[PDB]
Design a protein around this ligand. Structure first.
Ligand code: SAM
Ligand code: SF4
Ligand code: MG
Ligand code: MG
Ligand code: MG
Ligand code: MG
Lengths: 398, 326
RNA sequence: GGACCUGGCGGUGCUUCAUAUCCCUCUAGAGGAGCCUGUUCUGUAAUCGAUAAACCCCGAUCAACCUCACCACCUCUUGCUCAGCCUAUAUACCGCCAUCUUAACCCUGAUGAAGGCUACAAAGUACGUUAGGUCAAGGUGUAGCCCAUGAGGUGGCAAGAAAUGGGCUACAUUUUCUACCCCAGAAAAUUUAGC
């Protein structure tokens, strides 16, 4: 409960309410409809000129739905418990049913083309929103080094360029798939096998460097940890990425229960330090979206996700703007900047006559369903909530 | 709710439709002679003789053409009422081009002949004075798909800036039909368009025989007089849907006609939008009858260019001759 | 350490053809004008926001002084009726749609790992899942505010600019009107299919 009617008031630092309207309150983190850089869209369409017919539309739709509804691989112990329950109540067949068949996706050339056509714009939108979080809240940050695990098509690289190109000088892109690496190189070279890179300093590797000595300013993993075959693999990858994180570790997955569970495991892993004497002793905290380091109040039954609207790459099947629903967690080195941390709106805000419904993740670690009205909460706080939206912050104190 | 085809739309012409011989074929018809008698009483000169037999140079003057067109349009309305009462009874819309609005409103029971004629007169002398203030003119330009109008107006303006003049005027004045426009403003800009139509991609160009650049800000001096002439007038609610030219939509309440009729004087005429608002409909639906009450047949050609299917049911009231001597 | 066996490269290229899906080539139409929508930027204290709830009834329509929504001020309230509110929730269930997941025998090798074909024939034969949508032709619950998320009043609010995405109208000489239903008279770049 971060909104007590009649007690909580808007947080006015830097002389807010006097010097600037309500629509521009500092928790406004909404990003306008994302449009890809023209070079990237041109390269994608050129690379798909070969085969973009009716079959490709079906393949893209199938791949998108398959990835969206994919579950985490089931760990041994859960299968053991289910097997015991079924036996107490043939068992193997009943386990083939009511259990998800998780399979490795082998990204060959054809499946890489399909994945690019199906997910480039969506991934770019999600990563751009996650990066806008850091840019908006810490505008003095000028990263010089970026690593991106599971760099599929380079959407992370392109978003990082679009935001921090005047400071970034090294883009490490790790991906075990040679086809995916080749496609990323072609996309960076304007869709042609021979050309000059659009972004300078991009390094492509097939193996993840494992060494605490080398440390990047921004480490990213977008829709990548869900490809790993087991929780042990996810754990080791997240540990490596945190060890090599210099300032910010950005994890982005689908906006589903599976993606949110994966990200909450990663968040707990990073927050609970196990290493006895690490080379980098700085502690880690959650920069966004959580205003606390306590266990997620919403991991029990629901999930937590955020939406970013964007314009898809023009195709025979992409006509209208789309929404990208994604789960994010940003872990920052050091300690929280201050103690005036603000609730996060984790659900669409519903505007109704003279009241506003907002679901808040409060700094105390609990969810609050707040119906804000002028008479109860104050005109200024009501106006701030009225202009706020999904994924923003509400500037409230005491 | 009656099927369209038994309804009627009355179109009232504007300046440029004057001709020597208006009225002949209307005089013997009922009730026209006292309209021309009232025209004499209000104007101060015999409009009847000037319209019937004139040099055409006296008739082409701005002060004289507009009252002639107004009175002739109303007389043609009377003739149409005599021949076909059902057409006047089943009227759905009305629209005038520039001065025809003053006729259309009078036809709609929103203004009376005397006050409307006084307003038209004052408008005419005011516009003549505004034209005399500065050289200007109107140029009809027919463009092709590659023609750009705002662009061409722009270079026409830097031309006069290079020559040297305060805020040269050249802007599209009349929207008639697709790719046909009337530009208005200083004569030097119109000379520039006439001479380099080639780079302006204009298929045809024709200088209109008018006194000055109407429907531009050059007529600003004429706004204040006309406004006074309209303050005393008490405009009622039109009985039929009378369409405006400033924005090309129906006049809704009496409290806005007063200022719309003055804004028209310094705003472009939205004739194409008016035709679209009156006639546009799904393919296959029938169109209402259309009657051009007044001199000339220009609105007929404009309607043909705008909407051919609507033009199929178009007819004009003959104001120059009559088949049967009533 | 020696011998042998299965592998693993869902690997890499090169040769020829069957080479159907998929490709191109090819064929016929689709850019202008006027309105309406989608996104951005700028701007306002504020919404160019909606009519089982206006107006216009030739069609359709804009903002209407309808009313609701928003902004700035105020007023009530134990009141309508143990009052009042599409306020929320299908992220409550159920309905409906959609996403994804779902053998045996007989021989050979010394009864080693292991292997089993020849036709003029030589061991081979037999439901669950989803922070999913839908509260408009459908339901059962659960919660909210109840000196205000209820009821009123006084003013405002009625945006501006482009590049591009889409939609509707008219667009003619192989045309248009009349008579006839075919020998008459007057007027004047991608994209969509292909079969
Ligand atoms: C499908 S992409 C996800 C989208 C991509 N991260 C982006 O931003 O566009 C994830 C990639 O991670 C790679 N990957 C999976 N496991 C890996 C591993 N253990 N080490 C390195 N790369 C791995 C796969 O090749 C796969 O293509
Ligand atoms: S519900 Fe709150 S604590 Fe949980 S992931 Fe979302 S922001 Fe973080
Ligand atoms: Mg209400
Ligand atoms: Mg509602
Ligand atoms: Mg749902
Ligand atoms: Mg409004």
């Amino acid at each position: 409960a971060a909104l007590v009617p009649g007690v909580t008031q808007v947080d006015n630092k830097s002389g807010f309410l006097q010097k600037r309207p309500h629509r521009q309150h500092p928790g406004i983190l909404k990003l306008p409809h994302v449009r890809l850089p023209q070079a990237l869209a041109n390269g994608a369409q050129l690379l798909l000129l070969g085969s973009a017919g009716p079959t490709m539309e079906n393949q893209v739709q199938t791949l998108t739905s398959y990835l969206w509804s994919r579950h985490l691989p089931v760990e041994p112990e859960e299968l053991q418990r289910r097997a015991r329950h079924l036996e107490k109540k043939a068992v193997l067949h009943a386990l083939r049913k009511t259990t998800y068949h998780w399979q490795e996706l082998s990204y060959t050339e054809g499946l890489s083309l399909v994945y690019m056509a199906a997910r480039l714009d969506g991934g770019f939108a999600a990563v751009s929103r996650a990066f806008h979080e850091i840019r908006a809240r810490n505008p003095a940050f000028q990263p010089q080094t970026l690593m991106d695990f599971g760099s599929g098509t380079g959407s992370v690289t392109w978003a990082a360029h679009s935001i921090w190109g005047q400071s970034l000088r090294e883009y490490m892109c790790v991906d075990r798939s040679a086809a995916m690496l080749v496609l990323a190189e072609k996309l960076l070279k304007g869709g042609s096998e021979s050309g000059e890179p659009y972004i300078p300093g991009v390094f492509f590797r097939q193996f993840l460097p494992v060494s605490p000595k080398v440390q990047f300013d921004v480490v990213v993993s977008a829709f990548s940890l869900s490809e790993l075959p087991s929780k042990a693999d996810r754990t080791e990858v997240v540990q490596t990425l945190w060890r090599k994180t210099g300032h910010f570790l950005v994890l982005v997955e689908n906006g589903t229960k599976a993606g949110h569970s994966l990200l909450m495991d990663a968040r707990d892993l990073v927050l609970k330090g196990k290493e006895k004497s690490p080379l980098d002793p700085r502690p880690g905290f959650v920069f966004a979206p959580c205003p606390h380091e306590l266990p997620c109040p919403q991991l029990t039954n629901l999930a937590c996700s955020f939406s970013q609207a964007y314009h898809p790459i023009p195709f025979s099947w992409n006509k209208k703007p789309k929404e990208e629903k994604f789960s994010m967690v940003i872990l920052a080195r050091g300690s929280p900047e201050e103690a005036h941390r603000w609730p996060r709106i984790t659900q669409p805000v519903l505007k109704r006559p003279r009241h506003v419904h907002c679901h808040l993740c409060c700094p105390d670690g609990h969810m609050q369903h707040a119906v804000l009205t002028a008479r109860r909460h104050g005109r200024d706080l009501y106006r701030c909530a009225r202009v706020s939206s999904w994924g923003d912050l509400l500037p409230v104190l005491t | 709710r009656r099927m369209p085809g038994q309804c009627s739309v009355l179109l009232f012409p504007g300046q440029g439709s004057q001709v020597v011989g208006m009225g002949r074929g209307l005089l013997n018809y009922p009730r026209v002679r006292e309209l021309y008698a009232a025209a004499r009483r209000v104007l101060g000169y015999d409009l009847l003789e000037l319209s019937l037999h004139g040099p055409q140079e006296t008739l082409d003057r701005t002060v004289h053409c507009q009252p002639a067109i107004f009175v002739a349009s109303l007389a043609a309305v009377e003739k149409l009422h005599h021949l076909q009462p059902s057409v006047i009874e089943n009227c759905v819309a009305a629209a005038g081009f520039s001065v025809g609005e003053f006729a259309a409103l009078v036809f709609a029971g929103a203004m009376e002949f005397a006050e409307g004629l006084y307003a038209v007169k004052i408008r005419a002398e005011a516009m003549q004075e505004a034209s005399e203030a500065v050289p200007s003119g109107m140029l009809s330009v027919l463009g092709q798909p590659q023609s750009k109008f705002n662009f061409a107006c722009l270079e026409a303006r830097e031309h006069c800036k290079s020559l040297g003049i305060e805020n040269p005027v050249c802007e599209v004045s009349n929207y008639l039909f697709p790719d046909c426009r009337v530009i208005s403003g200083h004569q030097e800009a119109l000379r520039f368009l006439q001479k380099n139509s080639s780079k302006f991609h204009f298929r045809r160009t024709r200088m209109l025989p008018v006194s000055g650049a109407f429907h531009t800000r050059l007529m600003e001096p004429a706004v204040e007089p006309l406004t006074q002439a309209l303050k005393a007038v008490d405009i009622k609610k039109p009985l039929v849907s009378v369409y405006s030219n400033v924005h090309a939509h129906r006049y809704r309440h009496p409290g806005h006609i007063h200022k719309l009729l003055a804004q028209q004087l310094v705003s472009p005429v939205k004739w194409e939008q008016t035709m679209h608002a009156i006639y546009e409909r799904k393919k296959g639906r029938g169109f209402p009858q259309t009657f051009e009450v007044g001199p000339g047949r220009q609105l007929g050609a404009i309607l043909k260019s705008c909407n051919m299917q609507a033009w199929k049911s178009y007819s004009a009231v003959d104001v120059l001759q009559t088949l049967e001597h009533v």
